[PDB]
């Protein structure tokens, strides 16, 4: 992770029966804590607004967080490489439905690959998610990481705030658990967080339903 590593993202999902697939490619720079991704919906029109997938694909790969020198001891993500780790989540949108996600992150050659299955249920058809009322941007968060010795992994907790067009804010509770795939020693961390910032852009020469994602993540709190 000292250099620039290519990324591959594969997502197969169905939210309230609408099946969709999303494929993306980009590169992460852990040294500077940067991520860039172009993600494209291959099945046509995305049932859900793009920001709701930012965490799934984007916060999907968190190896590329920049852990400062005095905190390098707590970096589970890089510590689990190259065998990889499993990333499981329940994302519950307040007063609406629920994402439940299983993802595997590992190296396949010089490339890091993020493979996800997503299944969402109980969404209002005129609610903020299925009716596409979310603004095409993303807010700044704190991913609170904590150790789970019993599962030899970590747990994560954060509240994502999705800006709504009318000025309101759609809250999304993330409950995340990570487990390493490899038999080796991974170090399980003291309490800390990952402060995240994101911008969401467009490729003008891309006409398929897509999103261009930038992430900026640095660890803090020790």
């Amino acid at each position: 992770f000292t250099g620039v590593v290519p990324i591959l993202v594969e997502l197969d999902g169905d939210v309230n029966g609408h099946k969709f697939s999303v494929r993306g490619e980009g590169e992460g720079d852990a040294t500077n804590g940067k991520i860039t991704l172009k993600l494209i919906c291959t099945t046509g029109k995305l049932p859900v607004p793009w920001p709701t997938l930012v965490t799934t694909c984007g916060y999907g790969v968190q190896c590329f967080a920049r852990y400062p020198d005095h905190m390098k001891r707590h970096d589970f993500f890089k510590s689990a490489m190259p065998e990889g780790y499993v990333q499981e989540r329940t994302i519950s949108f307040k007063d609406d439905g629920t994402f439940k996600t299983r993802a595997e992150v590992k190296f396949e050659g010089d490339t890091i690959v993020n493979r996800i299955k997503l299944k969402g249920i109980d969404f209002k058809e005129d609610g903020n998610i299925l009716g596409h009322k979310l603004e095409y941007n993303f807010n700044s968060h704190k991913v609170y990481i904590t150790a789970d010795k019993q599962k030899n992994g970590i747990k994560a907790n954060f509240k994502i705030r999705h800006n709504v067009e009318d000025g309101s804010v759609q809250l999304a509770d993330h409950y995340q658990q990570n487990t390493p795939i490899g038999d080796g020693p991974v170090r399980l961390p003291d309490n800390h967080y990952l402060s995240t910032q994101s911008v969401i852009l467009e490729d003008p020469n891309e006409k398929r339903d897509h999103m261009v994602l930038h992430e900026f993540v640095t660890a803090a709190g020790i």
Side-chain angles (χ1 to χ4, degrees):
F1 290 121
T2 45
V4 172
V5 184
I7 311 180
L8 224 78
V9 170
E10 294 174 10
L11 170 60
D12 298 305
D14 64 41
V15 175
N16 270 112
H18 286 134
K19 291 193 178 304
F20 66 95
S21 297
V22 170
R23 304 295 177 268
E25 54 187 325
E27 56 181 49
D29 180 8
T31 305
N32 288 30
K34 291 179 192 185
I35 293 177
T36 310
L37 291 169
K38 183 182 166 174
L39 303 149
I40 303 174
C41 185
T42 310
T43 59
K45 187 69 173 63
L46 199 68
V48 298
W50 276 107
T52 59
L53 294 182
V54 174
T55 34
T56 296
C57 335
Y59 282 33
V61 297
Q62 315 174 32
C63 8
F64 297 101
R66 173 182 170 265
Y67 277 82
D69 303 353
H70 70 278
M71 277 190 56
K72 304 209 101 194
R73 184 200 305 251
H74 308 278
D75 193 341
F76 163 89
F77 306 103
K78 293 189 186 60
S79 179
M81 294 299 163
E83 288 99 324
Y85 58 69
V86 193
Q87 186 168 106
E88 287 173 304
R89 270 184 199 161
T90 49
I91 303 155
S92 56
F93 301 94
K94 186 177 271 313
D95 302 314
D96 213 318
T98 283
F99 286 170
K100 192 149 51 47
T101 68
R102 181 185 167 85
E104 290 148 355
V105 181
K106 62 189 175 177
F107 269 101
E108 291 186 350
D110 59 325
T111 298
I112 250 179
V113 189
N114 184 351
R115 278 171 179 111
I116 319 154
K117 292 293 177 170
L118 180 151
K119 187 151 162 304
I121 83 211
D122 309 347
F123 286 98
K124 313 190 227 223
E125 271 282 347
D126 71 314
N128 280 339
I129 280 77
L130 274 38
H132 286 261
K133 298 169 249 23
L134 295 181
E135 293 195 324
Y136 202 73
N137 54 62
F138 216 89
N139 278 277
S140 309
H141 303 116
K142 283 183 179 62
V143 181
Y144 295 100
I145 293 187
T146 200
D148 182 4
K149 302 88 195 159
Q150 309 58 47
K151 295 196 151 211
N152 199 26
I154 64 170
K155 288 297 187 183
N157 301 271
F158 48 104
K159 280 18 171 182
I160 289 186
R161 296 169 294 128
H162 287 142
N163 277 8
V164 192
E165 299 175 300
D166 63 32
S168 65
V169 173
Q170 173 68 54
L171 277 157
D173 286 354
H174 281 65
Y175 305 104
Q176 178 189 346
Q177 57 161 339
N178 292 122
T179 78
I181 312 184
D183 312 335
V186 285
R187 55 185 188 219
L188 276 46
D190 301 337
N191 295 351
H192 69 288
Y193 59 86
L194 293 183
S195 59
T196 72
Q197 301 183 82
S198 298
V199 318
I200 306 181
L201 302 173
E202 281 196 13
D203 183 352
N205 299 329
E206 231 316 301
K207 199 160 308 311
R208 294 174 286 179
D209 207 355
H210 77 283
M211 165 179 75
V212 175
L213 172 56
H214 292 95
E215 266 182 87
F216 304 89
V217 43
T218 309
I222 300 191

